[PDB]
Design a protein around this ligand. Structure first.
Ligand SMILES: *[C@@H](C(=O)N[C@@H](Cc1ccc(O)cc1)C(=O)O)[C@@H](O)C(=O)OCC
Lengths: 33, 249
């Protein structure tokens, strides 16, 4: 079941990346003004 | 300068580092708890396209390739989250840093200045007529010191830079400066325009184009104390560094 385990890891990275960029937009707008 | 957290366990970000990232957000954002509550677990967040790594036709002039390299770096965005997502051990062999740069292109997360230097090397190893060398700047403003680094470049005897900064004037310079001194003085003036005093410049040697090299990057081949040197000796030391690099093949 190694292909499914990689699938879960890839989904974790995808969910995290979407939150990282949403947070980055907020913090970029804060840092600017 | 100002402290920040580093993700030291690879990707996906481990649970403890992830919570630490959000705890830091709740501290410094005036709406920090509300920001997390909107974003965390949200199922309607934008999809971020994975930026395409640029590839180059042999007919494309190197300066045009560099514009594309810089555009790619910028597409990743400056990382303002408070948590650096890739750990950069500056004394690692080049081959290990190039493996990390490859992972930066696969995972496509926001980056700061040092990560961008590593990425810029990785994306210009295909340009043997381009020399690449790190330039670090230490500046001072309102009682605090600031560290910045860019990737200096030299094409056909003209100097420029690639990199990432939170300020538009402190990264990309097309390779058009006749001398290394002129390039560094342009950064010094850019710093001065946003009220930073340039204190130190640390210049590295030319970096190998072999991504499997076991050589370390030599970050501090010249370390220049700007105010101690004064204008004339500052320029002479930069001229000497430029000569030192021309002989490292
Ligand atoms: C280097 C980096 O990103 N440096 C910062 C320096 C800086 C410039 C201007 C202000 O107002 C604050 C900070 C940058 O170029 O944005 C990077 O590796 C790093 O994390 O250095 C500490 C910030």
């Amino acid at each position: 079941e190694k292909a499914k385990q990689k699938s879960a890891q890839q989904e974790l990275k995808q969910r995290q990346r979407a939150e990282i960029y949403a947070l980055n937009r907020v913090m970029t707008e804060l840092e600017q003004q | 300068g100002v402290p920040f957290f580093v993700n030291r366990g690879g990707l996906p970000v481990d649970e403890a580092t992830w919570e630490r990232m959000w705890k830091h957000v709740a501290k410094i954002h005036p709406d920090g708890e509300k920001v997390a509550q909107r974003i965390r677990g949200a199922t309607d967040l934008p999809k971020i396209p994975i930026p395409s790594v640029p590839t180059f036709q042999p007919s494309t002039p190197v300066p045009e390739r560099l514009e594309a390299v810089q555009r790619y770096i910028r597409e990743l965005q400056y990382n303002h989250t408070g948590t650096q997502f890739f750990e950069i051990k500056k004394s690692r062999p080049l081959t290990g840093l190039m493996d990390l740069a490859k992972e930066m292109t696969k995972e496509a997360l926001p980056i700061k200045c040092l990560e961008a230097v590593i990425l810029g090397i990785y994306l210009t190893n295909s340009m043997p007529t381009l020399e690449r060398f790190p330039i670090s700047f230490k500046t001072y403003f309102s009682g605090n010191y600031f560290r910045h680094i860019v990737l200096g470049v030299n094409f056909a005897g003209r100097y420029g830079a690639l990199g990432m900064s939170r300020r538009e004037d402190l990264m990309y310079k097309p390779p058009a400066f006749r001398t290394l001194s002129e390039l560094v003085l342009d950064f010094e003036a850019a710093y001065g325009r946003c009220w930073h005093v340039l204190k130190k410049v640390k210049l590295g040697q030319s970096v190998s184009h072999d991504p499997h090299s076991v050589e370390q990057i030599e970050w501090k081949h010249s370390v220049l104390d700007v105010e101690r040197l004064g204008r004339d000796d500052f320029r002479k030391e930069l001229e000497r560094h430029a000569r030192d690099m021309r002989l490292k093949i």
